[PDB]
Structures are given as structure tokens and as C-alpha cells.
């Protein structure tokens with residue numbers, strides 16, 4: 001059932017927030033602060049922004065029908081990072097390391 005699927009999704013996000021992955025997961029914790037980072041072109045490039053706190057809030061509010069909808073927002077968060085930032089940038093390599101953790105956990109359910 002989708003009820004048991006969403007419970008596993010809470011567990012995946014819990015690992016993503018844990019101190020174990022904190023070294024590369026921290027730039028995805030809260031929404032991208034465009035004013036603090038000085039990213040003048042971020043809103044023009046990224047139409048649908050996403051972060052781990054928004055996914056955590058949408059999960060508690062039962063905004064996802066199934067595990068696929070949760071995975072769609074998690075992948076949107078990574079896809080936005082790959083689209084905006086340069087390929088050689090630090091945050092892109094951090095996104096790949098966090099996605100390695102997500103893809104492995106998301107597949108094993």
C-alpha cells in the first residue's frame with residue numbers, strides 16, 4: 001500500500017538529515033536563499049525550487065499520494081542544483097553524493 005510506502009519515505013529523509021551525511025547534505029537542508037547568496041538569475045532559471053525542509057513539511061501534510069511523488073520532489077531538488085550551478089562546482093559534487101545515498105535507499109523499498 002501507499003500508506004506503508006510514505007512511512008519508508010520519512011525514514012529516507014531522516015537518514016539524509018542525519019549527522020553521517022551532514023558534510024555534503026547541509027546545502028539542501030533549507031530553501032536556496034537567493035538574497036543571501038546573491039543569485040540574481042536563480043528565479044529566472046529555477047521555476048520550481050525544492051529542498052529537504054519543504055519535502056519534510058509536504059510529507060507531514062500528506063501532500064504526496066505515493067512514494068513516486070516524494071521521489072519526484074527529491075529528484076527535482078537535485079535536478080535544480082545540476083541545472084543552475086556550473087558542472088565543476090563544489091555543491092554539484094555534494095548533490096551527487098547525497099543522490100547516491102537517496103537512490104540506494106529509494107530502490108531498496
Ligand SMILES: CCS(O)(O)Nc1ccc2c(c1)-c1cn(C)c(=O)cc1OCCCCc1cc(F)cc(F)c1O2
Nearest residue numbers: 026027028029030031032033037080081084085090091
Ligand atoms: C542551505 C540553503 S542556503 O541557506 O541557501 N545555503 C547555501 C549555501 C551554499 C550553497 C547553497 C546554499 C546552494 C545550494 N544549492 C542546492 C544550489 O543549487 C545553489 C546554492 O548556492 C550556490 C552559491 C553558493 C556556492 C556554494 C559554495 C560552496 F563552497 C558550497 C556550497 F554548498 C555552495 O552552495
